[PDB]
């Protein structure tokens, strides 16, 4: 199933290792200004 990469600094610029970090986000039922009553706010 698996295979390595071949990395040396003898590689060209297209064959250079990237340390890709991916940030993924969401929004859920999961999560101070004084309350104003009867004011458009």
């Amino acid at each position, epitope marked *: *199933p*698996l*295979q*390595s990469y071949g990395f040396q600094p003898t590689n060209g610029v297209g064959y250079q290792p990237y340390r890709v970090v991916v940030l993924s986000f969401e929004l859920l039922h999961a999560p101070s200004t004084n309350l104003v009553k009867n004011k458009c706010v």
Partner: antibody, heavy 118, light 108 residues
């Protein structure tokens, strides 16, 4: 990176001798592993596989002596017990790996002598 | 039955700068699943070619593999004084695996 073997020695025929071979550098776990035989002046003869990624054990029917093979994966080590001995098996053994068109992982142990004689 | 290998010649005493063709023939049609090894007698078998047509790290193109089916070829070129040792071919097509009987390239 490196393979170490259990100690070889002179054993009487018909007996049993467990063979230990521990890995280093990268694990046994993700790969398979093999055993081969070299008698002095004779070619390298394959013996048996191990396949940890499922579980299966294949033996050579040329030397079909129920030489049993299993693991100690958490020590990166492998155990094949020398069962039903006979003197022509007196040779050196190697821990082996085959580059099956995908990998380049062929790493070989140092070699220890099993001797079958009274 | 088993798959028979045919390594020819089983030895060849050679000289400096040669181009030796160590042939490993097969009893069946094996796709490319054949390898090559360096063994000075007492060493570990250092892999030379994988899948019968691909070089290896540390080993330059003085060794060169080709062939498929039944016919497999070890193309040693510009034969070096360190290359004189006992070599081997290798199937990985089926189970059981067998290896060739070896070819000792040695100084004439």
């Amino acid at each position: 990176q490196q393979l170490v073997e259990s100690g070889g020695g002179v054993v009487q025929p018909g007996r049993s001798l467990r063979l230990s071979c521990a890995a280093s550098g990268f694990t046994f776990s993700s790969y398979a592993m093999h055993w081969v035989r070299q008698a002095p002046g004779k070619g390298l003869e394959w013996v048996a596989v191990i396949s940890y990624d499922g579980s299966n054990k294949y033996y050579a029917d040329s030397v079909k002596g129920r030489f049993t093979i299993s693991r100690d994966n958490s020590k990166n080590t492998l155990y094949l017990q020398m069962n039903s001995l006979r003197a022509e098996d007196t040779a050196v053994y190697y821990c082996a790996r085959h580059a099956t068109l995908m990998n380049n992982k062929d790493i070989w142990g140092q070699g220890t002598l099993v001797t079958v004689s009274s | 039955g088993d798959i028979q290998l045919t390594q020819s010649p089983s030895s060849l005493s050679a000289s400096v700068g040669d181009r030796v063709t160590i042939t490993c023939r097969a009893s069946q049609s094996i796709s490319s699943y054949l390898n090559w090894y360096q063994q000075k007698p007492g060493k570990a078998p250092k892999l030379l070619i994988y899948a019968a047509s691909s070089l290896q790290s540390g080993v330059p193109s003085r060794f060169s593999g080709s062939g498929s089916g039944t016919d497999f070829t070890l193309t040693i070129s510009s034969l070096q004084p360190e290359d004189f040792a006992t070599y081997y071919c290798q199937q990985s097509y089926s189970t059981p695996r067998t290896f060739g009987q070896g070819t000792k390239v040695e100084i004439k």
